[model samples]
Target chain A: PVYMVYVSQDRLTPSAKHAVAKAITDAHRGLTGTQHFLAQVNFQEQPAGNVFLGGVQQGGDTIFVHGLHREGRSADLKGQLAQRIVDDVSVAAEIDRKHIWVYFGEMPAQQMVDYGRFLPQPGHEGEWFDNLSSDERAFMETNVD
Target chain B: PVYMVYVSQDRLTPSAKHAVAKAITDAHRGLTGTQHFLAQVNFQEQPAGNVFLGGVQQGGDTIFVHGLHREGRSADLKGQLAQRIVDDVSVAAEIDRKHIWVYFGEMPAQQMVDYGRFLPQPGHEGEWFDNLSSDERAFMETNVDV
Candidate 1:
């Protein structure tokens, strides 16, 4: 899964950005049981007047976390993950919970490629993991934490 | 709808960015009959090491267009729109079609807010438009072409 975090430019210090990224990684890995390396996180900083909510330009406090995950997760699981993301990101970014938004959507597993291989469907992760080259496995293992 | 375009930093000139945005707007408007201004496009540029594909960093040639639209379009319509976007954006950005990827997803219309009003359910756009304040309508009108 990939989480695209959009933050206001200069809103977070360098350390805060790292913390927020770590928080997001932990939350996703904890809740979804995905490998650490599989959770791709990207931060996009938007300057003032670049972000709007309700047709009005927003201040620098708002953050939108848009994630695309493998399909087959239950709605309840998705909702819980979204809430957890909001909670963790708010604390990590030093922003209010109300200002953080998360919209996690699903895509067919086959549509995504990671480590140069198409992702397996919901229950086939083990097979996918087993099929990777030893070198790929070694890289993934070292990053699993 | 919002289309977030992720590109490698320094890959596009300013004029190319404008043309790419224009191409996206025209594609969405022409295919879905949506307002031009409603097709929000944001460009997120990634430095060389920031973007990775297949577990390796990429050159500055690939572009990803990720879009979220209302939940009512037919599968065929969505696929066609995606293709048109690829075609138009490839030409506008001076990138090859094979290097462009488009992923268009759907969300319930009520979940989105536009112009300070909750988006109407699918097929209710006319009513939604009619109820907007005159000031809002005027603003929308002016931006329809610009």
Candidate 2:
């Protein structure tokens, strides 16, 4: 479960935001191998004065993405994902590659209770392999039946 | 100096979104008289499956606004601001109103540093009263070296 993608207000076109959203969702899914993972991308738009870059009020709008989701992904994956987001959004949204910042936030899955139960209930690791075929699943996790 | 607004993806119309944003910015200014308090309102849109309320997955989109800013205002002010946000967003966005949640978050103004200076920067407090008229300033915080 991923929440939002905050960025400058008017810099990105609607189509560009869509492309960035898709790119992030796809990248996350591939890294985690969880097909059911769905992330909603939001553009946090505000004027130049409203956003601060490196502590100085930005002269122009700056795009910074805060990625919020449930924890469990590895550090390497998160690192790679952030870079991927930077590159994808830079190209897709037409923003400078250096202007982007992606910070990944992880919340305990158990704290996320839904449907009268913990959506990421204990022993949910097997669900990560849900999209893979039987052979891939078997090879990936020898312990999981 | 900022507040966060989280909503369901595609839940509010374009007009409603604009309304909510303005309402939030104004409410913060009105309550604190921080005219220069440029609120960085962020809308975190998410799928219903990703967000949960009352320990249940929401069938439809849910609206949850988290207000973040430097901590200096009184508790009473913060509480009233939260209710103000809820009321403002409900009226402006035309959501069920029952599903909306507004929360105000505050942090120490000193703890924030930018470059080499403390955040909000020193002497920035009076800047909040910058736009106020001569009479309003005199009537307000009587201590700002007028």
Candidate 3:
């Protein structure tokens, strides 16, 4: 199964959030031949005086997505996903296609660990290790399941 | 009637440009009766490397409007414009609505004077002044219909 997703950011009023979400969901429902479908939209509420990298905040949106699928079909999957994203999210204009990225094949779980290494200690550990239950950890390590 | 125009850098591919333009246009169309029907979208196409000022060169979009009827109407216009802009121009997610300005009344014709007081010669006489014919000079000094 392959998962296709799109991400976008925009300074939207509280009222406009529903419209954006609906657009995403509507696009997802229109998809065919896909075994699984998932979409996520994040809205960052930024008021005046927000600061980033020690500079005053300029308002804008950032979008990201990730999906899982078989190796051979990756290219087709990516193309379809990008096209659907443009169709659904583009209410006023088309999304910048250059900003889109698609990754194929299995991403090693160790990569997640490697990513966690650079993050602040407690925060990284909390995200990487805290979610598993003791029994789930034992089952995986001992192959008890 | 006042006009609210949103302008952006023309950096999108052809397909993306059409999509974004339609989104912005539709939002304005939706606001038909609430405000005047004047709105425009502008773009600038340039490489991301070219520096404008302070070494910042990458292009982006800006939304500005004029003829907001009243304070409440202005607020509504700002809110809608900001929303639609963010939705279309992801690069321009944040907008400073406070930066919007309003111009009331008519502008003075003297403000359009080409070489008003900058002429080196007295009585506004210089290269720019000398280039003008008698009728042009007379028209500037005294309002002549033709």
Candidate 4:
């Protein structure tokens, strides 16, 4: 799953951006027990006037967190993930937690193909990790803890 | 519903951005029979080193289109919608069709609250539109041709 953090332009400083990203990565890995490297975080610093909340253009400090996860997770799990992100990211970004909105949507694991391999279903990542080529495994081992 | 177009930075020229947005808007409105203003499109020009394909950082022309629609649409309808966006967007952005990936995810319409109101369920937009305050309706009427 890729966690996309869409921040309002100029609202999040460079260091703060790193903190927010780390918060998301940590929260996801810590809560879900997903692989370290698989908790991918992407930041999209939306330009001014390009962002809106509830229909009005937002120039305020706002962060929209959208996570695309594999289907079958319980609603309770989803709510917990969202809450964890909101709590940690608000502190990281120095914004009110209410200013951050989080949404999680699910799709079938097979529908998400990356590295030319269909992603494994939830709880099956370890098995899938073992099937990777030596070089791919090395990349993961080297770059990720 | 906001259709987010995540494109590799520098791949889509400024003019091409408008074209690509139009392609998506037109395709979505025409195919789904939805209101013109309701099909909102947002472009995220991702900086280099910010995008990855299969965990490998990508510096090539790649676009990922993510659409959040109201749940309950048939799988066949979703397939047709994705194909239309791919076909039209490739020509508009001048990118190879193969390089563009389209994904559709459905959430209950009520879960998507925008404009201070819960979005209508599929096929009930008309009734929902009528309840909007006159000023809000004016904004929609002036901007969209219904």
Instruction: Please name the candidate that would achieve the greatest DockQ relative to the true structure.
Output: 4
lDDT of 4 by residue, A93-130 (tens): 88998888898878866445333245677878888989
**TM-score list, all predictions:** 0.60, 0.47, 0.24, 0.59
- Candidate 1 lDDT by residue in tens digits, A60-118: 88888888888888888888889999999888888889998898878655444454345
Per-residue alpha-carbon lDDT of model 2 for A52-126, expressed as tens digits? 757887755467777665667678877887888788777777778877777776644533322112335323545
For residue A33, model 1's alpha carbon misses the true position, in angstroms, by 14
TM-score of 4: 0.59
- Look at candidate 3 and give me any clashing residue pairs: A9-A61, A59-B94, A60-B93, A60-B94, A92-B20, A92-B23, A93-B19, A93-B20, A94-B20
Candidate 2 per-residue lDDT over residues B32-138, each given as its tens digit:
76543345567666544444221123444456675556765655666677677767877888765445544443457778642223456323656644655677555
Model 3: per-residue lDDT, tens digit, A36-107? Answer: 122234433322212110011112322222233222324343455445644454452333332222222233
Model 2 docking tier (incorrect/acceptable/medium/high):
incorrect
Decide which is better by lDDT, 2 or 4: 4
lDDT of 3: 0.34
Question: Would you list the rank order by DockQ, best first?
Answer: 4, 1, 2, 3
**In order, what DockQ does each candidate have?**
0.09, 0.04, 0.01, 0.11
lDDT of each: 0.74, 0.57, 0.34, 0.73
Model 3 spans > 4 angstroms off = A1-10, A32-58, A61-73, A92-145, B1-146
Q: Each candidate's chain B TM-score?
A: 0.93, 0.73, 0.38, 0.89
> Model 2: residues >4 Å from true position, as ranges?
A113-117, A121-145, B1-5, B8-146
Native-referenced DockQ of model 4: 0.11
